[PDB]
Design a protein around this ligand. Sequence first.
Ligand code: HEM
Ligand SMILES: COc1ccc(CNc2ccc(Cc3ccncc3)cc2)cc1
Ligand SMILES: [Br-]
Ligand SMILES: [Br-]
Ligand SMILES: [Br-]
Ligand SMILES: [K+]
Ligand SMILES: [K+]
Length: 396
Amino acid sequence: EAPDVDLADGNFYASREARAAYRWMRANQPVFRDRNGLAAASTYQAVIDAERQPELFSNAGGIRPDQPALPMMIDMDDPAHLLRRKLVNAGFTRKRVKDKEASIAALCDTLIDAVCERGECDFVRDLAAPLPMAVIGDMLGVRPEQRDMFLRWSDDLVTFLSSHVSQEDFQITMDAFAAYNDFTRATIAARRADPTDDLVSVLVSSEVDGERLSDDELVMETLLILIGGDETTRHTLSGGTEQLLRNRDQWDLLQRDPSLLPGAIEEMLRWTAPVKNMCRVLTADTEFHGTALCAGEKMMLLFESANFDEAVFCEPEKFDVQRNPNSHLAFGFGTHFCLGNQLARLELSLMTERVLRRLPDLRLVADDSVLPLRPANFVSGLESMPVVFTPSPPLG
Ligand code: HEM
Ligand SMILES: COc1ccc(CNc2ccc(Cc3ccncc3)cc2)cc1
Ligand SMILES: [Br-]
Ligand SMILES: [Br-]
Ligand SMILES: [Br-]
Ligand SMILES: [K+]
Ligand SMILES: [K+]
């Protein structure tokens, strides 16, 4: 019998029974319909095949199950999407991202300095959540003492994307957007008159095919970047480190061999899959991997399910930092492949290498059976992760 599940319900993704439900879907109905008839691609093959057919599986209806499209690149199809992405790509060239290494490392060291003397911290609150916020906030010109405000707006907006909000939460969402809009339009006006090397400056000057980003587009695209920056990577940092601590042979391998870190980051991404789904709207009736789909309905791409697909990943419930190949779909695939992937990987690398070296005897206070995941239908990971370690003095 099929699992009785609602794939638009955030409680499904907070359940540690989700992977059992995905396993059934992959073995019995790869393009699954949930208890409300919502279609979802559960196998790696079905996700890739949909990703590769953007004219049939469109982003232009919006990437959430019951919300309309917003005027931003992730809700656009080519050719318009390609121009928008090329414009925003000025902020994400390989050289610009790699050049952030020293500054990101400094933030990692400041955050570890704040807890290293204590011998205990909440890995989520004190390391995983603040590092990506500080990096993206610095790119956007946010004063350090205002990071919490931007993180609050980001939580409001990602909660809106992660659920079907009440009217009161709709109002909060609109208020947060209005505050972000006000701040960002001030930055745009200032950078136009006195350009710097910050993200808004680089985006203002970007030109492709004789076109530039409008103020409207700058607000929307930088907001997409803010929330990608501050709502996703945190969950790979916490949940990926959790797996290193649960399987101490994996922690020990990384401690003794820094050259294993790139493969470890990939396995942390495969395992944690912070983005649980993105939607595609059907542009025509189609028979897709055994399931009839109707023009105008949305189908979810279940990235965590694909990342645990035994047809692609041998023994997928084994966390193995050495896994090769590791062609996971945490960042998706195709036209919309995460623009921030290099930045996210760099943050994960720099914080993890410092955690391994500076907190070398790190351990979990209590095991996973009592560590909850955030209820959310879109992006999710650990709420809290208390950890202990031998104290050390700060680097300063
Ligand atoms: C581990 C962290 C992250 C994960 C798992 C992640 C995941 C994703 C996924 C699944 C998509 C859609 C791909 C698809 O549907 O095939 C996406 C798109 C995108 N992401 Fe991320 N993301 C992360 C971090 C970031 C960061 C840090 C940024 C920016 C600084 C960012 C910016 C974007 C943008 C702009 C898009 C839209 C690309 C397009 O539509 O062409 N993401 N991301
Ligand atoms: C109601 O007005 C608005 C306006 C803007 C937004 C924010 N749009 C948005 C933000 C974040 C993501 C998640 C994500 C980003 C990058 N990589 C991976 C995941 C998707 C869409 C919401 C509501
Ligand atoms: Br299949
Ligand atoms: Br479009
Ligand atoms: Br920048
Ligand atoms: K505020
Ligand atoms: K397994």
